């Protein structure tokens, strides 16, 4: 199999760890891990090729001991995430995550991922965002942001329902093979 390294980044609580666990284990977790600390390697076949895809989760800003610069070397593809219930997490894509990823991984393909797609139609989410004069992120906003940052693709998924989860990793694997 071809060896590729995937790193997942994005705002705290936008669903990165759960996306890795639901893809790797096919089960939404019941306990809390900030950062997957076991070794996840996925076997993925795309367009006839066997790929071993190492899944690197990341730490937020306060976990200095596992700071992201330690994890960026030799990355083959980036999953850059925001949550559909958080327009703030989307605004951090161009302001925070793209400058950081381009600093450490300037030539690596990016898949822009909108997580928690199940909350787009959730009334708690709708009413909480509406009290801020906000609304859940629309697909066209994700697509526009993909163009802005030069992402290889824009994908939406829900770790909670599994909708779109395998497809995110198949797209990331096809980008890593280029
Ligand atoms: N509704 C919903 N909640 C999710 C989803 N994925 C994760 N969460 C929840 O969002 C919170 C943060 O998830 P986590 O994966 O730890 O986020 P991280 O900080 O980006 O790693 C937790 O309470 C999860 O249970 C999803 O697809 N849908
Ligand atoms: Mg996490």
UniProtKB/Swiss-Prot annotation:
Its EC number is 3.6.5.2. There is a cross-link at residue 133 (Glycyl lysine isopeptide (Lys-Gly) (interchain with G-Cter in ubiquitin)). (Microbial infection) The basic-rich region is essential for yopT recognition and cleavage. One of its GO terms (molecular function) is GTPase activity. It comes from the Eukaryota. Glycans are attached at residues 32, 35. Residues 59-76 are annotated as: Switch II region. Changing residue 12 to V: Increased Rho protein signal transduction. Constitutively active. The modification (Microbial infection) O-AMP-tyrosine is found at residue 32. Its cofactor is Mg(2+). Regulated by guanine nucleotide exchange factors (GEFs) which promote the exchange of bound GDP for free GTP, GTPase activating proteins (GAPs) which increase the GTP hydrolysis activity and GDP dissociation inhibitors which inhibit the dissociation of the nucleotide from the GTPase. Activated by GEFs such as ARHGEF2, ARHGEF3, ARHGEF28 and BCR. Inhibited by GAPs such as ARHGAP30. Inhibited by GDP dissociation inhibitors such as ARHGDIA. Changing residue 45 to K: In EDFAOB; somatic mosaic variant; decreased Rho protein signal transduction; decreased substrate adhesion-dependent cell spreading; decreased number of stress fibers assembly; decreased cytoplasmic microtubule organization. The modification (Microbial infection) ADP-ribosylasparagine is found at residue 39. This is Transforming protein RhoA. SMART domains: RAB (SM00175), RAS (SM00173), RHO (SM00174). PANTHER family: RHO FAMILY GTPASE. It comes from Homo sapiens. Changing residue 32 to F: Abolishes AMPylation by Haemophilus IbpA. The modification (Microbial infection) O-AMP-threonine is found at residue 35. Interacts with ARHGEF28. Interacts (via GTP-bound form) with RIPOR1 (via N-terminus); this interaction links RHOA to STK24 and STK26 kinases. Interacts with RIPOR2 (via active GTP- or inactive GDP-bound forms) isoform 1 and isoform 2; these interactions are direct, block the loading of GTP to RHOA and decrease upon chemokine CCL19 stimulation in primary T lymphocytes. Binds PRKCL1, ROCK1 and ROCK2. Interacts with ARHGEF2, ARHGEF3, NET1 and RTKN. Interacts with PLCE1 and AKAP13. Interacts with DIAPH1. Interacts (in the constitutively activated, GTP-bound form) with DGKQ. The keyword Electron transport does not apply.
């Amino acid at each position: 199999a071809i060896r590729k390294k995937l790193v997942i980044v994005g705002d705290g609580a936008c669903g990165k760890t759960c996306l890795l666990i639901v893809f790797s284990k096919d089960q939404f977790p019941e306990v809390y891990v900030p950062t997957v600390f076991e070794n996840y390697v996925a076997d993925i076949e795309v367009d006839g090729k066997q790929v071993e895809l190492a899944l690197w989760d990341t730490a937020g800003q306060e976990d200095y001991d596992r700071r992201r610069p330690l994890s960026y070397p030799d990355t083959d593809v980036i999953l850059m995430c925001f949550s559909i219930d958080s327009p703030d997490s989307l605004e951090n894509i161009p302001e925070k995550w793209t400058p950081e990823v381009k600093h450490f991984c300037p030539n690596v393909p990016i898949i822009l991922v909108g997580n928690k797609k199940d909350l787009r139609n959730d009334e708690h989410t709708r009413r909480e965002l509406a009290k801020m004069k906000q609304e859940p992120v629309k697909p066209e906003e994700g697509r526009d942001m993909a163009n802005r940052i030069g992402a290889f693709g824009y994908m939406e998924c829900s770790a909670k329902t599994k909708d779109g989860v395998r497809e995110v990793f198949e797209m990331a694997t096809r980008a890593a093979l280029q």
